[PDB]
Structure formats: C-alpha cells, structure tokens
Amino acid sequence: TIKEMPQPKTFGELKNLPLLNTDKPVQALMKIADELGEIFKFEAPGRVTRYLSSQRLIKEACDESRFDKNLSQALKFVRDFAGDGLATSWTHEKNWKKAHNILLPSFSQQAMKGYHAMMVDIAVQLVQKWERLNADEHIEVPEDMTRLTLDTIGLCGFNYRFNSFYRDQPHPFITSMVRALDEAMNKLQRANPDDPAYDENKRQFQEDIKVMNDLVDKIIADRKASGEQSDDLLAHMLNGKDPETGEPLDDENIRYQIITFLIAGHETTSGLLSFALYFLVKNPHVLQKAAEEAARVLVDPVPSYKQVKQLKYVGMVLNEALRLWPTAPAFSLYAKEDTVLGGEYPLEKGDELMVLIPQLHRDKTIWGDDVEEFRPERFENPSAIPQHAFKPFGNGQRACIGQQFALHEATLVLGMMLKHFDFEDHTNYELDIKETLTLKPEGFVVKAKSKKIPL
Numbered sequence: 001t002i003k004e005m006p007q008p009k010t011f012g013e014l015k016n017l018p019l020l021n022t023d024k025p026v027q028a029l030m031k032i033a034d035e036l037g038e039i040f041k042f043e044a045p046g047r048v049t050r051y052l053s054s055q056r057l058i059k060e061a062c063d064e065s066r067f068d069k070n071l072s073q074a075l076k077f078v079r080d081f082a083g084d085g086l087a088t089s090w091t092h093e094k095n096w097k098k099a100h101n102i103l104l105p106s107f108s109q110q111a112m113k114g115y116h117a118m119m120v121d122i123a124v125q126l127v128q129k130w131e132r133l134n135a136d137e138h139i140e141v142p143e144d145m146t147r148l149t150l151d152t153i154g155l156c157g158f159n160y161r162f163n164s165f166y167r168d169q170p171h172p173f174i175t176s177m178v179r180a181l182d183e184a185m186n187k188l189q190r191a192n193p194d195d196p197a198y199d200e201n202k203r204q205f206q207e208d209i210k211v212m213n214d215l216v217d218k219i220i221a222d223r224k225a226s227g228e229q230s231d232d233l234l235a236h237m238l239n240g241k242d243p244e245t246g247e248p249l250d251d252e253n254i255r256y257q258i259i260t261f262l263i264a265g266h267e268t269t270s271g272l273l274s275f276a277l278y279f280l281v282k283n284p285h286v287l288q289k290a291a292e293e294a295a296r297v298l299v300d301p302v303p304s305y306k307q308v309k310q311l312k313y314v315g316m317v318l319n320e321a322l323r324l325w326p327t328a329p330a331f332s333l334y335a336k337e338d339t340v341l342g343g344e345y346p347l348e349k350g351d352e353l354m355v356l357i358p359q360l361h362r363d364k365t366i367w368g369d370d371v372e373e374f375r376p377e378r379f380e381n382p383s384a385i386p387q388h389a390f391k392p393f394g395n396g397q398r399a400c401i402g403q404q405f406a407l408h409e410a411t412l413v414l415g416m417m418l419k420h421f422d423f424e425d426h427t428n429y430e431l432d433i434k435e436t437l438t439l440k441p442e443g444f445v446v447k448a449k450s451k452k453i454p455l
C-alpha cells in the first residue's frame with residue numbers, strides 16, 4: 001500500500017522554495033536527503049518535484065518506457081540562448097531526434113581517434129604554460145582547466161582558436177557566453193524580474209545573445225563559402241543527413257548545437273579535471289600510483305590515442321572523482337503515464353522527479369561504508385556494479401553525447417600532468433564547492449615542480 005513522502009521545512013505560502021535561496025542549493029539538498037532519506041517531496045508556489053537519492057528508486061526513474069527528460073527551470077532559462085540544441089530540447093521536438101542521429105557518429109569512441117591530435121595541441125599549450133612558470137609561482141587550477149576545455153571544444157569542433165593561453169581576459173565570445181550563463185542562472189532567484197533594477201541585465205543579456213549568434217553564424221557561413229572539407233563537428237553537421245527523415249540540420253539549429261557544445265562541455269569537463277587533481281593531492285598514495293602509470297605508459301614526447309586508452313588507473317581516478325562530485329549534479333524527469341514508483345509511491349502523468357546524483361553516488365547499499373573515501377580501486381570490477389548505480393553522464397537516449405570526448409580529453413590531460421610535474425598543495429586548500437549550472441572547487445591552487453621531461 002501507499003507510503004507518505006517526507007518533506008523538508010516550509011515557509012507558509014512559499015512552501016519549500018526559500019530552501020533553494022542559497023549559494024549552494026545542491027549541497028543543501030544533499031543535507032536534506034541525509035536527514036529524510038531516499039525520497040522527499042519539494043513544493044514551490046505552482047509546482048512540485050520529488051528528489052530521489054537511492055539506487056533502488058533511481059533504477060526505476062531511469063526506465064525510459066515510464067519516464068522521459070524534463071527541462072528544469074535552469075535549462076528553460078539556458079534555452080533562451082541555446083535554443084533547440086540537443087541539451088535544451090524536448091525528446092518530442094523534431095530537431096532533437098534529427099540532431100541526435102546526425103551527431104552520434106561524430107561523438108563515438110572511434111571518432112576520438114580523429115580529434116586526438118588537436119586535443120594534444122591544446123594539452124601541450126597547458127603543459128608549456130606550467131613549465132614556463134618561475135620558482136614558487138602557483139597555478140589557479142579551475143581557471144587553467146577551463147582555458148583548456150574551452151579551447152579544446154573550439155578547435156576540435158569547429159577549427160576555431162580562442163587562444164585562451166594568450167589572454168588574461170577571455171575572447172569576447174567566451175566573455176558573452178559566460179555572462180549569459182551567469183544571468184540565466186541568476187534568474188532562478190529573482191523575486192521581481194521586471195523591477196527596473198534588472199533593466200541593465202536585460203539589455204546585457206540581449207547583447208550577449210547577439211555576440212554569440214553573430215560569431216557562430218559567421219563561422220558557419222565562412223565554412224559553407226570556402227567549401228573547405230573537413231571531418232570536424234561543424235563539417236558533419238554541414239554534410240550529414242538524418243537516416244530517419246532524410247533531412248539535414250538547418251543553419252540556425254547548427255548554431256545552437258555549436259553554442260551547446262561550448263556551454264555543456266566546458267565547465268563539466270574542467271570541473272572533473274579540477275576535482276581529480278584536488279583528490280590526488282589530498283591522497284598522495286593514489287597520486288603516486290597514477291603518476292607511476294603515466295610514466296610507464298606515456299613513453300613518447302606526444303601521447304598517442306593507443307597510449308591514452310592504456311591509462312587504466314587514470315580512468316579509474318576520473319570515475320572516482322565523478323562519483324564523489326559529478327559536475328552536472330542533477331537531472332529532471334517526468335512520468336509519461338500514471339505509474340507506481342518503487343511499489344509504494346503512486347505518480348500521475350506529468351509528475352516530476354529529480355535525480356540527486358552526488359547522493360545516489362553515496363548509497364552505502366551499493367558502495368559499502370567507505371563512501372566518502374577517494375578509492376579509485378572501487379572501479380576495478382565494473383561488471384559487479386548494479387544497474388543505474390553510477391550516473392554522472394545522465395540516462396538513456398538523453399545521456400551525455402559528449403561522454404567519450406570528455407573522458408578522452410580528461411585522461412590525456414591528467415596523464416600528461418602526472419608525467420610532467422610533481423604537485424604541492426602549498427596552501428593546504430580547504431574544499432569550497434561553488435555551484436552554478438555545474439560544480440567547481442573554487443580557489444583551488446597548487447604548485448607544480450617540473451620533472452624536466454621534454455615535449
């Protein structure tokens with residue numbers, strides 16, 4: 001029979017809404033889940049969702065015959081500049097399935113072999129930056145990781161160089177994309193959005209949408225004009241046809257895909273590299289085992305695709321960082337039809353669910369009692385992990401299309417970092433996780449002492 005769902009504290013007619021009026025709402029929801037357990041109701045004026053934390057319930061939420069992707073309010077705000085690109089589209093929009101089918105070959109593990117050389121171009125620029133630091137300078141870790149991931153998406157995707165390692169202030173496009181994301185997220189905690197206080201925000205948002213559209217629309221038009229034949233993401237969208245409908249993407253949807261790759265991939269991936277290096281410096285025995293593998297495998301001056309696939313322990317480090325702090329920490333679902341969740345929670349068609357990934361990844365019934373320890377070896381026998389226990393890239397057809405790109409990039413870069421430098425947590429850095437659409441260890445800094453191995 002039916003179980004009644006717990007609910008966190010309420011604020012009269014505002015219901016639970018003021019609980020998300022905080023700088024770190026994911027971390028606040030994790031503490032609620034510790035207090036209330038695997039499922040709790042969350043109400044706001046005019047809306048409700050149910051937050052899920054256990055593998056037992058999230059295995060069912062991941063059944064695509066019963067639940068489909070919902071656009072969170074954050075994604076609906078991002079949609080104002082990401083349009084109907086893949087991340088901010090409903091599964092029922094025609095341009096979702098058309099873009100999914102056209103793009104999927106461009107994102108496969110096999111496709112990584114053609115992106116590898118340009119990933120090494122940007123990775124070598126990061127290593128050279130660090131080798132050229134003076135004694136006792138330091139590294140700002142998320143900032144350098146983000147320079148790397150943005151430049152790698154831009155080059156590998158569309159043959160465009162942001163030249164982030166040549167700058168203090170980013171390329172105008174980046175400045176506009178970052179200020180537009182930041183406005184979209186700030187709209188989630190704005191009590192009176194038509195107050196004159198926000199006139200300048202409005203004006204600045206429209207200006208940044210035009211900067212992004214103008215740049216990306218020109219890159220697409222320049223490529224079509226030159227007839228330059230390439231195999232990059234832009235090439236495949238200009239050339240590719242959906243096998244189902246037989247149609248290509250139009251130029252406006254190509255622009256939205258390019259903007260989408262930039263915003264979906266830049267901070268997720270740079271957060272994964274930042275959290276990985278954080279956990280290595282805080283666990284020197286794990287750092288040592290990952291550095292030994294990098295030295296044994298990366299025997300040439302430039303890593304090859306085949307070498308990066310042999311950095312097995314580096315891969316487990318990266319999975320263990322995604323376990324503890326998955327950098328896109330939540331995703332939303334709706335019930336396609338009335339159904340019962342977990343034998344005891346009846347749901348009506350349209351009812352929303354939220355998957356709280358960091359909490360899923362702390363389920364002691366899956367991982368055992370040491371869930372807060374950073375132990376990459378927990379990924380040595382991955383066939384033993386039950387279904388839907390480990391969800392940093394989302395679920396099903398609406399899972400991350402960039403997963404192979406992100407992990408090849410992060411394994412290559414973290415392997416080169418461990419081959420080339422010893423690392424010092426010179427400030428005994430205290431973890432402070434800043435939340436935007438993604439998670440970052442804010443202010444994480446290290447010193448890197450060169451092992452003096454040439455490139």
Ligand code: HEM
Pocket residue numbers: 069086087088100153260261262264265266268269272326327328330331332392393394395397398399400401402403405406407
């Ligand atoms: C470690 C890094 C990354 C993480 C943790 C991550 C995480 C996720 C998650 C959780 C989703 C599902 C969102 C939802 O259900 O609402 C998603 C979707 C998506 N991501 Fe990633 N992502 C990463 C890197 C990337 C990269 C590098 C790209 C592009 C190059 C990319 C492109 C996309 C796209 C286009 C979608 C929407 C796919 C669809 O719905 O068809 N991501 N990602």
Ligand SMILES: C=Cc1ccccc1
Pocket residue numbers: 078082087088260263264265268328437438
């Ligand atoms: C479009 C932004 C985004 C960010 C994280 C995951 C998926 C998409």
